[PDB]
């Protein structure tokens, strides 16, 4: 590997890299724009030590005095059904509603798990409201207290629009103190001075300042039975979330994920990349057919296609490689199915037929052949019917419409194709056709699947394999050629099919293909 | 080894990896859901030092004062017979019962080992209960004290359902103090301040808070003859077990166990993996027969099987490898038993017989041959009977029903098979059959077990070995071929049998097999 | 790589390096000359400790006392519409205007985001002024206070020219204190002494000194209910921006950017650099044609060109390489389009024609040939018309005007050029022309694009490829030559075209070209 290789691999997978990075950045931006802002307030306390004073400030005594003073055991949250409703409501510019409660006494279910009883309050107007705990609907009025169904509730100054819902929870005193202690910190700022820097974070900028003022005043009143230099004020800029660092982390995470995925794909790739890989082993590659992006013959629908140009190059190579051959029969086979054998055989027959030569195309794939469908057919009396003795050599030959060559179809699918192909009638047909045609092209099944290609290849002067660009492997093609040669069939060379242009291929070998029109 | 190799090995053993990891995670989840939760309580003590105060708090004086005050030498546990009954009862939502005892005096057996006398109390109703120490049944009533059989017991406020059992133990005072000291810790929290952070853990959230309050009050009363800032309250969230870390440890442990097992299997694997291993040594592999998942011939029951397709490929290879041979006799042997010699020989005979050729199948395994069973037989007058002189060459030949070839069975098992096979009658039979049949296939025992294959191979023009996919070894096959060649028998090649597709094999060599139907 | 290579690469890309470095230095100089200068003032405070005194100086108490004393919650900035207007106005020598405000009360919109109400004040003369907040125009007079539209404003001593605009912002008290605290620092200077070094930075040298004096006096008056040794004076030399370090950083950044870009281009370069690269593979390079910077023939317009001299060298090489050839037909082809095939063929024909020989130039590029345009033409009856049977060999040959050789044009573009070139009429034409001309030069399309060159090359005794200097690749040329040789065409050698002189090429190989006139 080198700089050219890595740059080419990054250019090839650019769509994957961009998509993954964009998804990660979109998630990061959504989180940074929908997360609830958290504000911070601070105060300054002067001590005439401070090491016992920190633990006395963070003690349940002071914190619970604050909880009782400010009624922090009553928890009120506006109801947004999804996990993004609050964020989108804040983004839409809707101000958050709030209600003032000074008295709340729930029936204290106190079951095994739900230690915090909760109700839902729905606002009907500026004055009245509705309450439902477990489906039990009640109606209340601001001002007058409610004592019904074992529930005591006092709501004042509803500041919201009608239809809003609020979840009212009565959490235990220790839970409230634990929350306050989790959001409250004390420092010394000099490690020796009497200055104490109290800090408190929360999602309500006014409430956190009120809470910190209450804490400071309670501590002062306790200690005088300590000077407050700065009363608590809230920094208007939220301390969390940190949007820029969140987005940067998202970008970097997306980039590293994309890079590792690309590396895994590159290292797990095993297919053929260029004809040079085949020619290292000693396999002559006679053509490289590109992918045609255009049941019709390509060489007839679009004679000016790049794939048909590559097939004409293959025809020119064959006109020289097929001389000094024992006969005029050419067999095209391959390693794996759907490698391009029928495509290449049919289009090669078309391109050789337009040059004024008589061509016969035999579809000796007695299992899954569709040449009759691709050419327009009379399905009766095919190769199977001829081989099984129930047809003559003259009634099986047809004419391609937009072609210019004859063809023989597979007929009906037999139960014994490999035993049919061993009959001497096949060699009789080939010997008869070699005297009436200038070229016979035989299409065969793969060799790594069945043995029909190796049975047929005995009567074929020239045999070529078709290798798929990314699917097949060099070892696979070597295995196919050695299995052919083990049965007495000499494979002339190979044909790489379905080639596409890649930047890594350019930085390793080169272009090796152009357009000229 | 490389990335492709390791990924293939992980993919192959994925069932083992998943099973082991799932078992480990299931055990971890069961432990984390059935373990008893352990709560924690804490208090704050202010000292006007604290280094002698820690050791005075953790002293037997204070701890035993607490034990005597709270009657902690009476141990009560609800009876759950299994080691998971308590956990499953807690999961099922059953509240744990408890009883209040203020007086307990067991007869104090005080034997060599059982220093803690214990009894079992069974609840009958809200008022009465039953007591049995060593089978001695007694009945008691809440309120009135019991003084019978040297046992004094006072039970108040039974809060449980009838049928519950409780193990009541009177552990010694030092044992109670040791337990309390094990569950009790003191810290300074400033290393210089007068603040002390007392901590106590246990499985009863109310009891641990009561115990810590008693400890604090006893220490205060002792010291005044120290300020208590925070009385003990229990954190409702248990501190143990830590479910998430337990589950993560379980997952990681399962993964590492699976990986090490996979590595051991990979490094201890010795069998053949591909025909390339055999061809490195110079052994021509003529076929690779896959495992057929479908006493019948495969080539007759399922002629369209993948194994029968591979056997047809072998037939095509043999039609070319068996030319220029001294005669038309083919001997199939192998290295080890149950390698596939009879399977391959019989199916090869069937596939060569369907092509209109006359085939004779001789079962020259005079020890454990079952070809007659597989073909349908007249067990009389087999090869043994012919060789021992008590039969003619015409009465030993039979007909396969769904075959199309003749066969000769082994007859009765002789006591001297290797000495029977050395008789000139065997060569006479082969010479006679070579004039009446187009092909003779001889099935033989292994060569690493007996010498019959090497005796027979003298009269066979072509000899092929059958190697099992994972069982046999390259060295084993080389030993077999050299033992054959040492006795004057030239082995043409090999046949790999029982091949299966593996991801490691793909990432090392390739597919090398396909389906086409 | 070595010193010669790196020096040559730096010399080649000197224009890029200089341009990038100059752009970076220009940006750095513009920033350092347009950034607003920031001045610094300092004072000395003596303490009779100082560790609590630092935090008491930097406290909201003292800072807010200063804010209230100096009315620092009224923010006034002169209006410059661009982000460089202030800098360019300072550079132009314009003194910055200022206004004195002692009373400002905006209606306090206090919306969701814009917590700082702001207005714009436009100066009409030394006395009057205009005010517009959101389009509401008001007129005021220095002296008399304004109480209109809920806005209270008092402006004194307007010192500016008419037409100036000022943005007047009433930022909140905490924001003002935060700004002052951000620009204010305290140190001890001895870590033990009572000396305190107060510092304050800002863009107004007089205002920052006044602010620091107010801070010092407020702290003194608070502490006496501390000695001021040095009252605050402003250092006239701004502390920021640091112009020299900014410019040096710009220079170094430009240099490193240029170097990394040059390294990337060098490592991603893949084209041919010298004939030695081709001759390593075994390809005889017969010429190297330089770029001609001078629809006309070069060999006729400028016969004394360096490119025409290189073509005469090629002619001298050909007069020796074309002996012992089967005929007098020369085919010039190449790997990729726009490599120089038509240029080289036409100019070579001209240079061989001026030596008194009869030359025929055939334009066998039946797809995109423009030789008729380059020579002056009668477009009728070209090579296509001859090959398609509708013309004679005598009506297709024309005369080049400023040439001295005949030529055959492509005629009309046919739909089947490759099938036309396979007609025996082409060989008949070549055989006829080889008896009437001393040399035939055939121009062909590329070979990596189409197969026409490989069809034609059968009848050509000598074939040469044209390689482009930087565009084509050694692997590309090897692929072209092997594709030619695979179709039975023997390529004699290569011709490097479009060569330019480079310092890296000199320090690797040498000059290899000179001028002599
Ligand atoms: N270079 C190619 N460009 C476009 N289509 C192709 C190409 N090669 C094969 N195909 C098409 O993809 C399908 C599979 O190829 P096919 O030749 O039919 O399989 P097989 O070789 O096993 O007989 C076919 O529909 C074929 O037309
Ligand atoms: N590729 C295979 N697929 C399915 N079954 C097989 C295969 N090879 C062997 N067997 C079966 O496994 C058993 C053992 O093989 P066998 O040929 O009888 O042993 P041996 O070679 O020693 O005579 C047999 O029942 C056989 O049918
Ligand atoms: N060494 C060169 N100096 C100046 N111009 C050149 C040189 N080589 C090619 N060209 C000009 O650049 C253009 C492309 O070259 P051309 O020979 O026409 O392409 P092709 O080889 O594919 O037929 C032409 O206009 C040509 O005149
Ligand atoms: Mg096909
Ligand atoms: Mg057997
Ligand atoms: Mg051209």
Residue numbers in the entry:
A (entry chain A), B (entry chain H), C (entry chain B): 17 to 64, 85 to 261, 409 to 477, 494 to 716
Q: What are the paper's exact sentences on this?
A:
Here, we report the characterisation of the structures WzcK540M2YE (Y718E, Y717E), WzcK540M3YE (Y718E, Y717E and Y715E) and WzcK540M3YE_N711Y (an additional N711Y mutation) corresponding to different phosphorylation states. When Y715 occupies the active site (1pY), Y713 is bound in the same pocket. The structural and MD data reported here confirm this hypothesis, showing that the tyrosine most stably positioned at the active site is the one immediately N-terminal to the phosphotyrosine (or the engineered Tyr-to-Glu mutation). We show that it is binding of the i-2 tyrosine to the tyrosine pocket (where i is the number of the residue positioned at the kinase active site) orders the tail between the tyrosine at the active site and helix α23. The presence of the negatively charged E675 in the tyrosine pocket we suggest is incompatible with binding a negatively charged phosphorylated tyrosine (or glutamic acid side chain). During the progressive phosphorylation sequence, the kinase domain is a rigid body. Structural alignment of the kinase domains of monomers of the full-length protein reveals increasing tilting of the transmembrane and periplasmic regions. When the octamer is viewed from the periplasm to the cytoplasm, progressive phosphorylation results in a clockwise rotation of transmembrane and periplasmic regions relative to the kinase ring. The movement of helix α1 is directly transmitted to transmembrane helix α2 and then to the periplasmic domain and, in this way, the phosphorylation signal from the cytoplasm is coupled to the periplasm.
